[model samples]
Target: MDPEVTLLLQCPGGGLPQEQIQAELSPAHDRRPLPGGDEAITAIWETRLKAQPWLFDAPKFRLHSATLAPIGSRGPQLLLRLGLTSYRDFLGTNWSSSAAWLRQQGATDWGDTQAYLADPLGVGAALATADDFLVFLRRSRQVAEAPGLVDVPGGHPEPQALHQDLAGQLVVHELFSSVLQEICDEVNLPLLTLSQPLLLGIARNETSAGRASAEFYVQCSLTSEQVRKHYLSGGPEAHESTGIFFVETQNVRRLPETEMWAELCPSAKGAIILYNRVQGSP
Candidate 1:
């Protein structure tokens, strides 16, 4: 019920079976409304760019909406409807000064559910290694968002490859596979070392006006100790974090109740919530 992280839809127990998640792609959601106007929104992007010069203006997936329906006796399944957005617009809209204003204006008279804001679909992993420890990363102070805070390994799922390779077409499997991609790039974990990237659910980061991100529960074939060494050695995206930390997989259920909970950024909190729910009682 906490607004900091809203659980949009979640899998049943353990995790949503790999076959249960279905995605429908479209180009319509790519058109972010600009009730705030180009002048206003453009200013934010420019100012952000001036501040963080290294920011990339890459296209990203937009998690438009989601639903949970049952498949007869098989069980309930998740349907994700996706669209497209860009990091530039995300910086302008969702991370804009008028984010709430844009959301209200878009929903009020326009009847568009904050389509004015860039809702980039991101992916996070509740990664448990062979040694049964959940990995956590400390965001580097240089990062644009959530700097110097605890976060689960995650990042916006890039749409560039799919966009350039095809014509705005998204590979359904790639959407979930991108989560594993994040693990590899962020945690330096081998893709083959991960098994059954379970789609637990979608969680919205209230910090970014409820921007959506899919959270997956994955088990790594590598031991925690092995991953720790790899993390220390670094990965392609290692510069994004300052340090790597681990938690006993058994303690994930009680994460939010502890004082360290205060250190979790919205994305991590959201992922942790979905993870604990899908996992049920400890």
Candidate 2:
């Protein structure tokens, strides 16, 4: 399955403070592994309800339902399409691979298999601490086999308790902020330094693992500028991200397309494409 994405955009404003920005960008953290946290997802099949499979027909597949219809007094209503896996073909011969050959090295555990797109979708931040970004310049593959595949510094948002009748529009912003806070703690970047994100786009994908994925795209454009200029001004850690640079929209498409792309963490590349379409770009 060649499920691929490309995001294109021009640079916004200029003269962002690279040093202060680096200080604010957060670092990475190692959390206690979740149950079933590391087990690889197996290939899932899309089945049919008919007695005999028809040559020309839409086949039915099992998908985890993490969405619900917006109800009265919920303000603006948006369909909850998060984590609705459908028609993913992971076991097929064609597969885009993840950063590391997960199947080869193996994960820590099976990890929890709960639906992230249920109500509040889980957030995966890939922003670089100035240091981390700098190191990325020296050794780009450390981030991923593909450069710019991961950019948001935030990590996955912790699961939350259930709530009722949440506003759809507001929920997106709240989730973004919560994930940003989590990234701030790990990377040591301040919350304010991150750019005010304009919701770029949203894409839906069903991976071979039978996992439904809804990818959201967002950007802090000026943040890249900040890294470019101020990387050298900081203390010991200041120069860490000195070599980091922004990945243009066209470049994101160059990332290796494989089944593993589905398994990689959430990132700006996917978000940018979704946002570009939302903004009416080609």
Top candidate on TM-score is 1
lDDT score for candidate 1 against the true structure: 0.77
lDDT of 2 by residue, 1-282 (tens): 335432222211221111111111011111122224422222212232233344232111112233222333233223332221112222211132441233222242323232211111233333433332211132234442234333433333332334233423344454456655643443344566665443222333223222222333333333554644444344336432224445444444444463434434334335434433443243
**RMSD (Å) per prediction:** 3.2, 15.5
Score every model by TM-score: 0.87, 0.39
The candidate that achieves the highest lDDT relative to the unseen native structure = 1
Query: lDDT scores for all predictions?
Result: 0.77, 0.32
User: lDDT of model 2 at residue 239?
Assistant: 30
Q: lDDT by residue for model 1 over 16-133, one digit each (tens)?
A: 7556666667775464657546677678778878988987677777888887776344643766777877877787788877788888877887687567878888888898888878
List runs of model 1 lying over 4 Å from the truth. 46-55, 71-76, 111-113, 160-170, 235-238
Q: Which stretches in model 2 have alpha-carbon errors above 4 Å?
A: 4-75, 81-154, 161-163, 166-174, 182-189, 195-225, 229-243, 248-269, 280-282
lDDT of 2 at 261: 42
